[PDB]
C-alpha cells in the first residue's frame, strides 16, 4: 500500500477506536517510524535464522527448532517474497515466553564500513 495510511491501518487494527478518537499516538507513530523506515543496516536472514534457533533453543524445544528449519525451507521454495529478512526479524523482535548479555551476540553492520 502507500506507507502513510498503512500505519493508520495498524493503529486501527490493535485498538478498534477511530482515527478521530485519538490523534497523539498516531502522531507519535508518524514521529517514530519516519526517519527509521528505510534501513541503515545491512540485511541478513542468515544471522537472524541463527538467532531464531538460539531463541527456540532457549525455550528448550529442540523439535520446534527443527520445525522452523522446515518452514524456512518452504519460504524459499515458493519465492514470492523479496525481503524475507524483515518479517522474520520482526517476529523475532516480538518474541515472548509462553512458559544476560546480547552485545556479545552477533548483530549486523550499521553501515560504518560501507557508505554510498
Amino acid at each position: 500500500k502507500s506507507p502513510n495510511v498503512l500505519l493508520q491501518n495498524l493503529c486501527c487494527r490493535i485498538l478498534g477506536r477511530s482515527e478521530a478518537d485519538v490523534a497523539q499516538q498516531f502522531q507519535y507513530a508518524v514521529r517514530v517510524i519516519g526517519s527509521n523506515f528505510a534501513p541503515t543496516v545491512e540485511r541478513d536472514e542468515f544471522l537472524v535464522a541463527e538467532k531464531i534457533k538460539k531463541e527456540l533453543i532457549r525455550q528448550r524445544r529442540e523439535a520446534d527448532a527443527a520445525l522452523f528449519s522446515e518452514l524456512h525451507r518452504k519460504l524459499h521454495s515458493q519465492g514470492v517474497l523479496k525481503n524475507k529478512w524483515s518479517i522474520l526479524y520482526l517476529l523475532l523482535s516480538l518474541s515472548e515466553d509462553p512458559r544476560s548479555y546480547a552485545t556479545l551476540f552477533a548483530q549486523a553492520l550499521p553501515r560504518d564500513a560501507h557508505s554510498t
Binding site: 490493535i14 527509521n36 515458493q78 525481503n83 518479517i87 526479524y89
Partner: protein, 65 residues
Amino acid sequence: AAAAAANLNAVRETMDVLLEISRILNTGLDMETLSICVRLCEQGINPEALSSVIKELRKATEALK
C-alpha cells in the same frame, strides 16, 4: 489467468507458513493484524521502531480497560 491465480496460491501458502512461525514464537497478534505487518515488511522496515509501537498500543488500553 490460471498461472496468475497460482501466484496467489503460493502467497496463501507462504502466509500460512508465516502464521505458523508467528505462533511457535508466541506473539499476541492474530492473522488479521499480522497481514498488515506483512504489508509493512514488504516495503522494508526496522522493528526497533515497530516493536515500540506495538508495546505502546497495547499500553494505551490499560487506562481504558
